[PDB]
């Protein structure tokens, strides 16, 4: 019935829907019914889209940021195929026209009723684009391969659509009553309490009287805060810390003083606390769900009267440049004084102005909000800064989203990971960000795919399980069919975990050959063959993983026995020969961020016409210390290649010569040189140390790349720029001296470095939002500072390039 759907979502999301119901929370009840309708009406809209708009939803085009080629085309019904020669500048229509036209000759006898499917992939070619804007066509040209496509008629596409259908009054100083608690420690117990608006204190942090450290922490005190109740802003957050002293932190807990209906809360409360690492303003505002084990604090919120935060209508009723290029009190005063100027003449300095406004004075907040309601839209870069925890106000949050609505699907995808982490900072379940993500996800299946996995991957974290579960359920209501596709992915991943556990056990008792044989036998079981085959890759939904082909599957020798799983697809040909690595026991989150950043650098470079031949391979956490990495085929580790050469320095170049005979070598050396420049710069900027020959790989094309990003951000040394002699040797064509090739290489590096600096704030804004994620190596200011320093953002370009040159020369000396 709908019974089945409910049980399908419960399995898919990793939480039973009955668990939601058992909280008997209207916030949650309302979140669920609110969004379910929102998601259900989005499904509505889509089931009536035109066939090209459906393609846009389900198969978003994959593009790049004159000359001729051979393309093979067939039609959906037959085996017969035709090979033409087309231009890289041609449109898909022209290609479809030739295809149609021929079929007519051989078929004894209108392009616009067709789209071209990439054989064996969930990828289509359509739209007004040259064939070498399409990533698959591009891929084939740089690799040499022949594009194989299938003419799909509009009515076949519509068959797919149809088969996937579903107040100011209160001047008294704010106060609470700290009643008692129930905890464990060695001393006397103190409760410190403090009121926050983002990172900023709304007043001084009143503390408890000292009470012995045994059993319950009875207090029955009245805590009064240095602030009027009418001055508490909408997003006011009360923050506790319980600790011992003769310092020993024990626990923390936060809550919103206003509930999700704008009512000021009153009065009693049991706060189930989170274990501590001293106040944690950024911490979640929801209680610890381990209500058996957690220490708890009972408090009382006094009745001040029913009081709601005023509606917007009431709210609305109530040397500049030289500092505007982190400032003093008099500077702040100037900026606040100048707010109208700021809006009219420096609209992009909104963030600055927001941080100087007095959130602990309601009158000031009102005047700021009135400016905000007429404020011009901001660039996306500026909106990314506003998503920071430092901007907690809901109107600000809403303004930020409003400026982000113009994000292209491509941009949104590039920033999605960060936007999901920002949900952790949200105060309430129903929020503009969640609505925006769910809307965009329901309009673009790729976005929906990566949103799903970002959420699913953290369900084992109790602070986000509820929020993320709820979002995934909403999403599933909005696409029943995608829900089935994702279940199939879940079933594969479930089987891989079991397979990997077995491998961990077996390798402890037997040789690797024996274990591998057992792995193979396990995989050939009907249940495994079936679970592991015929699915969309979680790494990239457009890649279909068809028949898992064992004999080629193995596992690595390293601790948590990462699995190496290979696939083939008759229908896709060579493009269907794809591999994934399943890893369980390692935290994949830091490879994802890093690989993501590298992707963004590649994109920023390509946007200036600089293609450094980078390899931004897929990486996707799917669960608790679980996830996938995309295999880059026809590549091996530097270590491995340093394995016939008389001198070890030549092993690399000999290998390249062997894979690139004759005049092919010069292209490979160029690919090596550009990619080396890319990764030299990327690893310097990102502070990725511990680079060695086991975690640097090369492709047979010549392109160098990095794997195993365990320790970025100098993490803390200050990782120098690195040039390896073996790499300089290849760049210089195996010559001792070749300053023509070398100083070109030095040019590539400098160009790459200077382009990144120009987008320095993009990197800082993105890393700022990633502080939400609790990555151990992105936890504080010192980590953000690393980026500031590596991009030398405090300098003029010039100064920065001179600085960079010292470092480059530094690195060169180091490489004998
Ligand atoms: O010794 C073996 O039995 C063995 C079995 C299968 C493969 C290998 C060689 N190997 C190991 C790895 C490897 C080891 C540890 C970490 C990683 C990794 N490869 C990775 N990739 C990613 C992109 O595609 C190339 C492989 C990523 C990665 O993080 N890559 N290749 C060795």
Automatic annotation (TrEMBL):
InterPro entries according to UniProt: ARM-type_fold, C2_domain_sf, Kinase-like_dom_sf, PI3-kinase_delta_cat, PI3/4_kinase, PI3/4_kinase_cat_dom, PI3/4_kinase_cat_sf, PI3/4_kinase_CS
Domain C2 PI3K-type stretches: 170-302
Enzyme's top EC category: transferase
Entry's localization field: Cytoplasm
One of the Pfam families matching this protein, by short name: PI3_PI4_kinase
Signal peptide range: none
Pathway involvement of the protein, from the record: Lipid metabolism; Phospholipid metabolism; phosphatidylinositol phosphate biosynthesis
SUPFAM superfamilies: ARM repeat, C2 domain (Calcium/lipid-binding domain, CaLB), Protein kinase-like (PK-like), Ubiquitin-like
GO molecular function, one term: 1-phosphatidylinositol-4,5-bisphosphate 3-kinase activity
Keyword Transferase: yes
Keywords: Adaptive immunity, ATP-binding, Chemotaxis, Cytoplasm, Differentiation, Immunity, Inflammatory response, Innate immunity, Kinase, Lipid metabolism, Nucleotide-binding, Phosphoprotein, Transferase
EC number(s) on file: 2.7.1.137, 2.7.1.153
Catalytic activity: 1-octadecanoyl-2-(5Z,8Z,11Z,14Z)-eicosatetraenoyl-sn-glycero-3-phospho-1D-myo-inositol 4,5-bisphosphate + ATP = 1-octadecanoyl-2-(5Z,8Z,11Z,14Z-eicosatetraenoyl)-sn-glycero-3-phospho-(1D-myo-inositol 3,4,5-triphosphate) + ADP + H(+); a 1,2-diacyl-sn-glycero-3-phospho-(1D-myo-inositol-4,5-bisphosphate) + ATP = a 1,2-diacyl-sn-glycero-3-phospho-(1D-myo-inositol-3,4,5-trisphosphate) + ADP + H(+); a 1,2-diacyl-sn-glycero-3-phospho-(1D-myo-inositol) + ATP = a 1,2-diacyl-sn-glycero-3-phospho-(1D-myo-inositol-3-phosphate) + ADP + H(+)
Family, similarity comment: Belongs to the PI3/PI4-kinase family. Type III PI4K subfamily.
UniProt name for this protein: Phosphatidylinositol 4,5-bisphosphate 3-kinase catalytic subunit delta isoform
Species lineage: Eukaryota, Metazoa, Chordata, Craniata, Vertebrata
């Amino acid at each position: 019935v709908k019974k089945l759907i409910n049980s399908q979502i419960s399995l898919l999301i990793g939480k039973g829907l009955h668990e939601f119901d058992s909280l008997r929370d209207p916030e949650v009840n309302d979140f669920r019914t609110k969004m379910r309708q929102f998601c259900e009406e989005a499904a509505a809209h889509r089931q009536q889209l035109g066939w090209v708009e459906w393609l846009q939803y389900s198969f978003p085009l994959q593009l790049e940021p004159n000359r001729a080629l051979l393309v093979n085309v067939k039609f959906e019904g037959s085996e017969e195929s035709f090979t033409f020669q087309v231009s890289t500048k041609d449109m898909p229509l022209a290609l479809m026209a030739c295809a149609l036209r021929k079929k007519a000759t051989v078929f004894r006898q209108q392009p616009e009723e067709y789209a071209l499917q990439v054989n064996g992939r969930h990828e289509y070619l359509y739209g007004n684009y040259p064939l070498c804007h399409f990533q698959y066509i591009c891929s084939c040209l740089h690799s040499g391969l022949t594009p194989h496509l299938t003419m799909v008629h509009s009515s076949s596409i519509l068959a797919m659509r149809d088969e996937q259908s579903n107040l100011w009054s209160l001047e008294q100083p704010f106060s609470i009553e700290l009643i008692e608690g129930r905890k464990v420690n060695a001393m006397k117990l103190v409760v410190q309490a403090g009121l926050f608006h983002g990172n900023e204190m709304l007043c001084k942090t009143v503390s408890s009287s000292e009470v012995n450290v045994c059993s319950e922490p009875v207090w029955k005190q009245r805590l009064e805060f240095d602030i009027s109740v009418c001055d508490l802003p909408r997003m006011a957050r009360l923050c506790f810390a319980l600790y011992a002293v003769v310092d020993c932190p024990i626990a923390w807990a936060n809550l919103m003083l206003f509930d999700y209906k704008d009512q000021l809360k009153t009065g009693e409360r049991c706060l189930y606390m989170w274990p501590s690492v001293l106040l944690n303003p950024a911490g979640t505002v929801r209680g610890n769900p381990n209500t058996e084990s957690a220490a708890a604090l009972v408090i009382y919120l006094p009745e001040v009267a029913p009081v709601y935060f005023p509606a917007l209508e009431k709210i609305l009723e109530l040397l500049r440049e030289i500092l505007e290029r982190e400032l003093y009190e008099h500077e702040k005063d100037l900026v606040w004084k100048m707010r109208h100027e700021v809006q009219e003449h420096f609209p992009e300095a909104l963030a600055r102005l927001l941080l100087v406004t007095k959130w602990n004075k309601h009158e000031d907040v009102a005047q700021m909000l009135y400016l905000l309601c007429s404020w011009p839209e901001l660039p996306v870069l500026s909106a990314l800064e506003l998503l920071d925890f430092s901007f907690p106000d809901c109107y600000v949050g809403s303004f930020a989203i409003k400026s982000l609505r113009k994000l292209t699907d491509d941009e949104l995808f590039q920033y999605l990971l960060q936007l999901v982490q920002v949900l952790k900072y949200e105060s309430y379940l129903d929020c503009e960000l969640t609505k925006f993500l769910l809307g965009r996800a329901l309009a673009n299946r790729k976005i929906g795919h990566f949103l799903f996995w970002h959420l699913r991957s953290e369900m084992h974290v109790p602070s986000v399980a509820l929020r993320f579960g709820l979002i995934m359920e909403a999403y599933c209501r909005g696409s029943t069919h995608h829900m089935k596709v994702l279940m199939k992915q879940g079933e594969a991943l479930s089987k891989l975990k079991a397979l990997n556990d077995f491998v961990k056990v077996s390798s402890q008792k037997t040789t690797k050959p024996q274990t591998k044989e057992m792995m193979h036998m396990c995989m050939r079981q009907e249940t495994y063959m079936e679970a592991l085959s015929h699915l969309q890759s979680p790494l990239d939904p457009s890649t279909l993983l068809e028949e898992v082909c064992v004999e080629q599957c193995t596992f690595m020798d390293s601790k948590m026995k990462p699995l190496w799983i290979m696939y083939s697809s008759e229908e896709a040909g060579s493009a269907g020969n794809v591999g994934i690595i399943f890893k369980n026991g390692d935290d994949l989150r830091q490879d994802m961020l890093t690989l993501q950043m590298i992707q963004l650098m590649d994109v920023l470079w390509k946007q200036e016409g600089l293609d450094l031949r980078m390899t931004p391979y897929g990486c996707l956490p799917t669960g608790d210390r679980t996830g996938l990495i995309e295999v880059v085929l026809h590549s091996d580790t530097i270590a491995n290649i340093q394995l016939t050469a008389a001198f070890n320095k030549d092993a690399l170049l000999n290998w390249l010569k062997s894979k690139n005979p004759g005049e092919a070598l010069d292209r490979a050396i160029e690919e090596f040189t550009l990619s080396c420049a890319g990764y030299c710069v990327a690893t310097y900027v990102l502070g990725i140390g511990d680079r060695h020959s086991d975690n640097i790989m090369i492709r047979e094309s010549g392109q160098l790349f990095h794997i195993d990003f365990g320790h970025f951000l100098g993490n803390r040394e200050r990782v120098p720029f690195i040039l390896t002699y073996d790499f300089v040797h290849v760049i210089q064509q195996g010559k001792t001296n070749n300053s023509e090739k070398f100083e070109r290489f030095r040019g590539y590096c400098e160009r790459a470095y200077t382009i990144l600096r120009r987008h320095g704030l993009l990197f800082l804004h993105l890393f700022a939002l990633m502080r939400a994620a609790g990555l151990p190596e992105l936890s504080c200011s010192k980590d953000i500072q690393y980026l500031k320093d590596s991009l030398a953002l405090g300098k003029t370009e010039e100064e920065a390039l001179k600085h960079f040159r010292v470092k480059f020369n530094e690195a060169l000396r180091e490489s004998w």
